[PDB]
Design a protein around this ligand. Structure first.
Ligand SMILES: CNC(=O)[C@H]1C[C@H](OC(F)F)CN1C(=O)c1cnc2c[nH]nc2c1
Ligand SMILES: CNC(=O)[C@H]1C[C@H](OC(F)F)CN1C(=O)c1cnc2c[nH]nc2c1
Lengths: 369, 369
């Protein structure tokens, strides 16, 4: 009689982080019944990712988020998750990260005495209002979890110090890395890559809010200099244009034909473009933990980092927010093959693509299957 | 402009525990607006208590827990308390103990970015399902709290072990002890007290499931021997008895009019009767924590104690459930005024009746008032 394992996909980004785990669960059909419960409002891409992974949801709830209050999402979610857990009676529920849905899924499981496996556990800012409500959600999920799958020693240590059972804390790595084995195709077509040809692509990502002002203007002046010094380079910045930016951009970037501001890329397009990138400029934590497993040097557009492990391993370098250090570090990697290849061949400390294996082995051992 | 402090009364036993805290908040009317919210299902005893303390609720919610699921209590209570908090806009919400209401009161506060102070914080079993759901409730409340009012060093240690911020953890003692200066009145009469003279009163209580049968018979046999050897002693046993259990009592004790089997005492009568007792025999956790602050030695009708600090301080002594052990130790204390007076004068480690003062102090300091 099979261990009934219910994986929750509460949101589109979770698709990529949880699909590989489900694939791993589906490789043990004698011992495990994989049940997939999707609760996201927006499913088009989620279904896109599900399709590539060969995953058909068993349960679909519509927990509405858009213009909904924390209270409304909290009560409806809890009711609907309780109902689906009484309906499927799973032996364990797997929940990702720091969403309100993860929190209430964990509460619903606790209210049915169903064990919780917390994927990506242990991240702490210890500021309950930054991020809000994510910090508290992951602390709340944490007290209710029976098994903790931390991406890193740092997050595993945070749980140890909260007096969690050390036998229930596993350093698994980041399951997003696991996804790249599936999402990155040997051959792929996209406008970016058609226009790229045999040029080296610098792929830039930047949050608009935290780089609003001088930062982005500095990044623009820097990328402009990069393409001025390197005729075989194209810079691609996927970003939601707002005539704020459009002026900001043209004012500095001009129209010389090798800096392209495009609409955001969906996760599969992003993976496949990043996989063909010579260099990444980013302020994304996910890019910092994932892109290095594609062999891509990553410069971090921040004076400060909460990912010291990547800095120390040599997969990341702090570039700051100032024009001169952004230019200077990118220029180096573009002008010295040895400096590029060193960063490129550095082992990604956030995972080796086997996180899902380690998660499923911990589950099976916990249940003595 | 005043700090708005909202105190939740969620269950009947909280009335005695939180009323002294409200009284102490009402002693600072220039710095503090005291706002009282009652959500308890059963009201007669609570209302009696609030009136003794001169407390008028600002908000009354009916949250039903008669044959109600955790889910429904959780969602309806979250809604109810959220609405109250949106209206009254407290600067801090004070919650007691391990209840589902405390948990959701804290979550509602969090969902309004209102600070929570946790009265009676840090009790740990470390077993998520025992008690169920109380252990999880106190852990969930634990992560959300801004201030932790621990009755004992052990409770504070438990919180420190979970890596809570030491500056937010206060050993206050047990607020129930603070009630005694209000509830215990020198001008107080009770039938049972009239029948007692300058006679020494042994107050006996046993309500534990595990003290049914033989242990009751051993107690009654030991009481018989005690009133036969000490002619100036009356015994009061406020319990309800099945008719056949009454007959067992009568068979062992006789009807010689110095042992009073009576109906259970309400909290106020009990306080005042206990306060005029020479000795107490109990299997109640709370009597172990409270009765010593009245200068009454407490003999515990159990083989082992869950109140180790009382043993250490010499406020408590185990009597077991064997006739001989109960007789032996009660006889010692009724024979030797020294051994009685000693236990009578030992300091209660569960509090010195200033827990409410320490809580108010901690709140004023934290909010820079
Ligand atoms: C947790 N953070 C994420 O969601 C990561 C994962 C992935 O990075 C990975 F491939 F290395 C894409 N990503 C972005 O932050 C991101 C930024 N700018 C974008 C513009 N268009 N798509 C975009 C994705
Ligand atoms: C578990 N905590 C409580 O409820 C404590 C508090 C109070 O004790 C305090 F004053 F020391 C009364 N109490 C009793 O357990 C208790 C026992 N037998 C009784 C007989 N009649 N009323 C009775 C109350």
């Amino acid at each position: 009689e099979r261990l009934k394992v219910m994986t929750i996909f509460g949101t589109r980004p979770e698709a990529i982080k949880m699909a590989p785990l489900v694939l791993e669960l589906q490789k043990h059909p004698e011992k495990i019944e994989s049940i997939v419960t999707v609760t996201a409002q927006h499913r088009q891409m989620l279904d896109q990712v599900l399709s590539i992974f060969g995953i058909t949801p068993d349960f679909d709830l519509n927990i509405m988020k858009d213009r909904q209050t924390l209270i409304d999402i909290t009560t409806r979610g809890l009711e609907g998750l309780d109902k689906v857990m009484k309906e499927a009676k799973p032996d364990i529920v797997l929940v990702h990260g720091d969403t309100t849905t993860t929190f209430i899924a964990s509460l619903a499981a606790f209210y049915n005495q169903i064990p919780v496996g917390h994927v990506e556990a242990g991240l702490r800012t210890w500021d309950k209002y930054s991020p809000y409500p994510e910090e508290m959600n992951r602390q709340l999920t944490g007290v209710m979890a029976d098994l903790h799958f931390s991406p890193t020693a740092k997050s595993a240590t945070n749980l140890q110090k909260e007096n969690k059972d050390e036998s229930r804390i596993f350093i698994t790595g980041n399951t997003a890395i696991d996804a790249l084995k599936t999402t990155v195709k040997e051959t792929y077509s996209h406008p970016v890559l058609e226009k790229l040809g045999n040029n080296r692509l610098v792929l830039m990502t930047a949050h608009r809010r935290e780089n609003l002002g001088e930062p982005m203007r500095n990044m623009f002046r820097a990328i402009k200099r990069l393409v001025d010094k390197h005729e075989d380079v194209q810079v691609v910045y996927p970003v939601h244009m707002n005539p704020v930016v459009r002026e900001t951009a043209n004012d500095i970037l001009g129209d010389y034909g090798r800096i392209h501001l495009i609409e955001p890329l969906d996760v599969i397009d992003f993976h496949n473009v990043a996989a063909r990138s010579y260099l990444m400029l980013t302020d994304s934590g996910g890019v910092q933990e994932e892109a290095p497993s594609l062999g891509v040097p990553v410069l971090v557009l921040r004076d400060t980092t909460e990912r010291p492990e990547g800095i120390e391993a040599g997969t990341l370098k702090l570039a700051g927010t100032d024009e001169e250090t952004i230019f200077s570090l990118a220029d180096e990697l573009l002008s010295d093959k040895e400096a590029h290849d060193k960063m490129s061949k550095a082992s990604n400390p956030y995972g080796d693509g086997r996180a899902s294996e380690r998660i499923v082995e911990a589950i099976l051992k916990h249940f003595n299957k």
